[PDB]
Design a protein around this ligand. Sequence first.
Ligand SMILES: Nc1ncnc2c1ncn2[C@@H]1O[C@H](COP(=O)(O)OP(=O)(O)OP(O)(O)=S)[C@@H](O)[C@H]1O
Ligand SMILES: [Mg+2]
Lengths: 50, 100, 250, 101
Amino acid sequence: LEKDDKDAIEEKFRERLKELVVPKHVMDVVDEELSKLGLLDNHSSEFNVT
Amino acid sequence: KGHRRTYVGAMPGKIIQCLKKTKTENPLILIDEVDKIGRGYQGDPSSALLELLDPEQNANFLDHYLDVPVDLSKVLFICTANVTDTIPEPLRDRMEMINV
Amino acid sequence: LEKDDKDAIEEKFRERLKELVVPKHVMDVVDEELSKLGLLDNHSSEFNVTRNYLDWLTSIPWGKYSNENLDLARAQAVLEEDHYGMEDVKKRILEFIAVSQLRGSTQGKILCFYGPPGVGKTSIARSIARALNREYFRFSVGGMTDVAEIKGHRRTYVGAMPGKIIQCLKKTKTENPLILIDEVDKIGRGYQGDPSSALLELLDPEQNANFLDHYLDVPVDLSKVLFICTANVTDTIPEPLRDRMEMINV
Amino acid sequence: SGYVAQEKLAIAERYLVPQARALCGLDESKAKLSSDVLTLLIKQYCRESGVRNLQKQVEKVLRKSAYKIVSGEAESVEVTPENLQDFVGKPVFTVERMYDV
Ligand SMILES: Nc1ncnc2c1ncn2[C@@H]1O[C@H](COP(=O)(O)OP(=O)(O)OP(O)(O)=S)[C@@H](O)[C@H]1O
Ligand SMILES: [Mg+2]
């Protein structure tokens, strides 16, 4: 009973990232946050924060 | 400069909030009336402003909320102060004076 | 193919710890927490804090060291190429490479330049770090008033992470980065645990080996770093803290 | 509280000097240090209760001796107070215009 709380919430950001030309540095930090999202449960205090 | 983001409601510092609103990497930030910044009872913003205003090192601006250095080299900062005396000298060095 | 998803991460923490020279203070606490993690369910509310705490503690580099270029003849070139003058700093660096060259293993220090603004104070460390080739860093401290950046939080709080210096050390895999605090004299007064009181325990040449950030409280060796600090005038500094560090006058 | 310059000289030669020497690896032979040169550094520079600043001084001279071995020419430095002027650089305090009679 949820739409954007685990994978799609990740994706729309991913697709959102493309047009920007990010420095690789922050991109890696983003990729870390993305993995940490995937590990995180869909509903948590850390989840909404991060 | 925001806060650590481990605080409950922390959100990023002014300039970044200014920048999200205007998609450009080169908005025209316009600081106003620099002379009358607060002082003498809490952490003076001017101590922090050097981090913003360094002509070259600003390219690695570092926000508490988002730790990652923030290039803003394209920006065109501007600052106003009716008399350029209240400004401590090292800060006054960074930025060319102009006299209307 | 959900072949032990809860163990692969425990293995991962093994692998990252294999290569490391784990300090004796850590190696008990780590693996016991990995066991405790092995008891509880992956969705257990504590598990995602513990998985973070290990993820930090497994990840911050432990004793890896970057051997530096030693012959000084070649050091002269790179030392001269990007700045002119500042001869006294050149001599101090000649001393540093000489002594560290003498008793084998590398050793850290602290220093503190000061003089007119725009002399190049902020402009040398990039050269110095390029000289030794140990990894560079910079960290303005002007107006800072929160010790947490040097310490982190208690891990009871959601999202607590160890102090920023440790985040740097994670970001620079060698165990001996050239940390660079900057503009120390303009550090703020937070009126409640101001940073200078914290800083003294860090900057004490002798006590630094047992820095204990509140987040993960196990002591860390930190002698190998060579801190540098800067200020445009050398009056705001508290008397002992000014004693703690060399006062080169750019 | 306090440390008289005589006591500080005693402590240094018997505690600091060996201590810093074992910490810096210089041979006891290779970096000779007279009590005289130390007396000069006491009379002219370190006139205060703390011991650390003197520790900085001994380290400075030991450092300069280490580099001069590590890449100079001499197999040993031999510091005499006339030499000291370049190692410590400009004296801070000025010696008194010691009148005689
Ligand atoms: N010896 C030098 N050779 C070349 N450039 C130098 C030298 N000394 C200073 N600079 C220049 O100094 C500029 C700024 O250096 P900084 O070290 O940032 O100055 P500063 O003393 O840190 O002043 P602040 O920022 O007020 S603390 C750079 O553009 C350098 O090129
Ligand atoms: Mg500077």
